[PDB]
Design a protein around this nucleic acid. Structure first.
Lengths: 313, 126
RNA sequence: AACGAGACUCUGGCAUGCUAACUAGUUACGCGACCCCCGAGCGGUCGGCGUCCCCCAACUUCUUAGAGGGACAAGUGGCGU
């Protein structure tokens, strides 16, 4: 039966792992961000003595790098940072193409479109904003926006239509359609602020979570509240699987991998159980991302490590 | 060394946790930025202090109840302890009997049921 | 509850992040000139030495001074009611 083994663990950070992402073009790369103010591009050897080595280290920020995302070609990479700026990397030696100037506060969330021509940003400005790849502002959203910090935005894969998700700490999830830039809907739910949201690879769903730590499911186009599940104390990051209908929820002491059909927990990932006391005996898990193979998944922790796992039958 | 926190910190730290309990994390940096938005602290160094004490309080509030300030969920569990305890619903176990010299009082007050007799020895400490 | 203490102001220590500079520099050539073969080669060229030449060159690391960020007993282990 499909179950999990502890694969290995990476090392090479002085700051807490904030995000991880992986391009399906090169699954032999993997990319990471951290509060050591650098994004590290790795070189994955599949030896079990290690599991990878840092290849290069991209440098140049004056505050944390919150979120990071790959290009659809894997030849570019983009970052959002708490210095209020973004950078557009050339992941071959270094040498930033462009830095995006204009925010008054942190840039928390960021995402990179499928056509590689639209780039969004969530900010503690309380503004979602759109960005040309030339590094200028196609649009700015300041009407019908969140009344609190913007937690996470997403581009939605679709048949062709433009839809983007937005969720803030005002305990609401707003869906936006481009070329009118209007509220498609407002979804109400979750007591306490929202941390994260993520969209299905098919794109008709929004799995949302927050302080509540409950996983509520919404319909993108039907606009209906499907159901709610108790996901534990707090869920900081979510990521669907590419080759299954699972959903992997990142809670503090454990990662909870959920089968969706039927609705049940498959397993709970436990890491090293080393004796420590008392407020967070293991480090909290904060980010996670699947590989495109779907065999292996990765995790971000606050001990500066990325723990690897692998599915075993 | 030294650097014992003053009262100006401890006064506002309690207040800021009471009315913005939800916004708090347990990280330094997140709790800083919240205090920056829900209030203005007119210095920068002062801000870095009030955050750190707000953090240090929030550690203890996730254990038993603090005696300097109140939150809602503690007053919930207060009410839950103070309306029924699981120990009894019976009064007290319904039948309790008593020894003589109490029976003599009850004899002269028209009661004559549910008693035992033991006539325990003399005397105090003896 | 108030004054003093602290808070505050100035100064030092951390920026290959931000802002911009022939009354500040660096780098790059374009160089042409001088110099010694001093090294491969021949003296040229390539390399080395500074100065003049420097631009309608490129940049702001160094220098300059402004806006910002950073340190909080923050994290861990002991100890303390």
């Amino acid at each position: 039966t499909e179950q999990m083994t502890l694969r290995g663990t990476l090392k090479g950070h002085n700051g807490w792992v904030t995000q991880i992402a992986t391009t399906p073009q090169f699954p032999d790369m993997i990319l990471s961000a951290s509060r050591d103010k650098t994004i590290i591009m790795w070189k994955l050897t599949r030896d079990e003595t290690n599991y990878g080595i840092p290849q290069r280290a991209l440098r140049g920020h004056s505050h944390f790098v919150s979120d990071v995302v790959i290009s659809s070609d894997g030849q570019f990479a983009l970052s959002g940072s708490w210095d209020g700026t973004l950078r557009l990397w050339d992941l071959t030696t270094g040498t930033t193409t462009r830095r995006f100037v204009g925010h008054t506060k942190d840039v928390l969330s960021v995402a990179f479109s499928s056509d590689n021509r639209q780039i969004v940003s969530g900010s503690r400005d309380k503004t979602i904003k759109l960005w040309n790849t030339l590094g200028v502002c196609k649009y700015t959203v300041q009407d019908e926006s969140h009344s609190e910090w913007v937690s996470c935005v997403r581009f939605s894969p679709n048949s062709s239509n433009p839809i983007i998700v937005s969720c803030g700490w005002d305990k609401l999830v707003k869906v936006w359609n481009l070329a009118n830039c209007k509220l498609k809907t407002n979804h109400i739910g979750h007591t306490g602020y929202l941390n994260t949201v993520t969209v299905s690879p098919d794109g008709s769903l929004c799995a949302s979570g927050g302080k509540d730590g409950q996983a509520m499911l919404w319909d993108l186009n039907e606009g209906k509240h499907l159901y709610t599940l108790d996901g534990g104390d707090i869920i900081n990051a979510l990521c669907f699987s590419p080759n299954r209908y699972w959903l992997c929820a990142a809670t503090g002491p454990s990662i909870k991998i959920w089968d969706l059909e039927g609705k049940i927990i498959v397993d709970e990932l436990k890491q090293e159980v080393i004796s420590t006391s008392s407020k967070a005996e293991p480090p909290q898990c904060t980010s996670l991302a699947w590989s495109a193979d779907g065999q292996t998944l990765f995790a971000g922790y606050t001990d500066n490590l990325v723990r690897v796992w692998q599915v075993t039958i | 060394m030294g650097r014992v926190r003053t009262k100006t910190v401890k006064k506002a730290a309690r207040v800021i946790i009471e009315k913005y309990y939800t916004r708090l994390g347990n990280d330094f940096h997140t709790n800083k930025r919240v205090c920056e938005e829900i209030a203005i602290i007119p210095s920068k160094k002062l801000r870095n202090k009030i955050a750190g004490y707000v953090t240090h309080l929030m550690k203890r509030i996730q254990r038993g109840p603090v005696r300097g300030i109140s939150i809602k969920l503690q007053e919930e569990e207060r009410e839950r302890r103070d309306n029924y305890v699981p120990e009894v619903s019976a009064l007290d176990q319904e039948i309790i009997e008593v020894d003589p010299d109490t029976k003599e009082m009850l004899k002269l007050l028209d009661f004559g049921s549910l008693s035992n007799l033991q006539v325990t020895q003399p005397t105090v400490g003896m």
